[model samples]
Target: MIVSFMVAMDENRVIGKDNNLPWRLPSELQYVKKTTMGHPLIMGRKNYEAIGRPLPGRRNIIVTRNEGYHVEGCEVAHSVEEVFELCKNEEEIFIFGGAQIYDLFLPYVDKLYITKIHHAFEGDTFFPEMDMTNWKEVFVEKGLTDEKNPYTYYYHVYEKQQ
Candidate 1:
């Protein structure tokens, strides 16, 4: 299966604060929902509990160190390998959150979709550093900020270098 990541970060690579997204961007959430439609979203236990519900129209595969963890309507895994087992039949899977999970899958990721806010914000959690040397840029689209969003942002798609 193709492994990819979809995430939003500030200029500093901050993705979350206190177990929540540091910013609120309706369009960003919409993008994720639309992009992951008909696919599985693999996340950590913290990421799953933070959202508090299984994302509809996608299989929720959660990675956690806790062996006793169980949640209705979702699959649980103890490691990245286990997550692969859960999604073996799928064509692609999106690694959807928490810094630790990103670090775990970086070696195997085939592509990355990053939505970056032009400015930085205070946040405790962050996406792993993406080395440009390892990825080739495919495209980028800049978006203007409106009243609802305080900062301008850009979307970039990168494919792993062969």
Candidate 2:
């Protein structure tokens, strides 16, 4: 199975502020929903809480240390290993967000789908630096700039270096 992550980060690696995204890029949001629509998305409790509910048309798996914590349409797992068991036979699984969860799964991810936003914001959460020595860039697409948005950005795909 291919384990991967999908996230958007700013130039400073900031991803979230007050448990929410720092920007509202409709195009990027659409991309995320379209890409993971039919797949199972694994995320941390904080991430799930931030979103408030499961995303439509996707299986939401929450990794939480909280015992017996339940949310509608969410399947709670205690650890990454448990998540692995839940999706072991699947062809691909997308690890969604929240800094702590990303850090925990970085070593196990085979690929990364990153949206490199061009601006920085004050944020409490950030994505860890991608170790280029261990990964190779495979795709990039520059996004169109709009006045309403802070800055132009690109979507990049990277695979683990063999």
Candidate 3:
């Protein structure tokens, strides 16, 4: 199965602030729904908790170390290996992270969908730092901004080098 990451960050690589998104970009939210509509999604416990409910139209897999933890309408995974085992039959899966989850799955990720916000914001959480030397940028487009999505953001798709 192909492992991929879906994330958004600002110029300073900040992804979240106080367990919530720092900006309001309705367009980016739509982009996320479109990209992962039919695929399974892997996310950390905190990430899932922050969202407060299962995202419709896809299987939600929450990874947490809490042994007896459970969530209605979602599958629970205790480790990265458990996550892979649960998804072994799938053709592809997207990892929606809360920093630590991204770090744990980075080495196994094959593709990345990143929304780069052109401006920086104050944030308490961030995306992991990595060398992009072996990843090839395959697609990129500037996201349109309007009254709701009033920020300059670009969508970037990258594939790991063979």
Candidate 4:
């Protein structure tokens, strides 16, 4: 199965503030929902909590250190190995994040779907420093801003170098 990353961050790599996204961009949310449809999404417990519920049309799997943690309508994996076991039949899997989860699954990622917001915001959580020298850019689209979606963002797809 292809392992992929789906993440959005600002100029400073800030992804979250107090367990929530630092900004709101409706189009970006739709981008994720559309791109990840029918795929299994693996995320940290905190990320799941921030979203508040299982998103429809996709399998939501939460990774947590708490063995006893359970959520209705979603599966829980205590370790990365368990994540593999849960998605063994899938053709592709998307790792949605909170910093810790992204760091843990970085080695297994084969492709990346990144949405880079043009502006920076103050936040406590951040995506780790990434060196793009090892990846081949495959796609890029400029996302424009509007009254509803207030940030200018760019979507980039990269495949790991062979």
Q: Is candidate 2 or candidate 4 better by lDDT?
A: 4
TM-score of 3: 0.86
Clashes of each: 0, 0, 0, 0
Q: Residue-wise lDDT of candidate 4 within 1-162, one digit each (tens)? A: 999988877777777543345544455456667788999988778667767788899999998989889999999999889999999999999887766776788889999888888887677767666577888889999886788778788888889986
| Candidate number achieving the greatest TM-score relative to the actual structure | 4
Clashing pairs in 4: none
Which digits, one per residue and each the tens of the lDDT, describe model 2 over residues 28-129?
Answer: 554566778888888777666656678898888988877889888888888888998988878889887666777788779898888877877677666677
- Superposed on all Cα atoms, the candidates' RMSDs to the truth, in angstroms, are 2.5, 2.6, 2.4, 2.2
* Better model by TM-score: candidate 1 vs candidate 2: 1
Report lDDT (CA) for all predictions: 0.79, 0.76, 0.80, 0.80
lDDT of each residue in 1-162, candidate 3, tens digit only: 899888888878787643235544455456666788888988777667767788899999999889999899999999999999999999999987767787789889999988888887777776666457888889998988878777788998999996
**Against the hidden true structure, what lDDT does model 3 obtain?**
0.80
Of 2 and 3, the candidate ranking higher by lDDT: 3
Backbone-clash count (model 2): 0
Worst 10 residues of 4 by lDDT: 16-25
Give the TM-score of each candidate: 0.84, 0.83, 0.86, 0.87
Q: What residue runs in model 1 are displaced by over 4 Å at the alpha carbon?
A: 18-20, 23-28, 124-129, 143-148
Rank list by TM-score: 4, 3, 1, 2
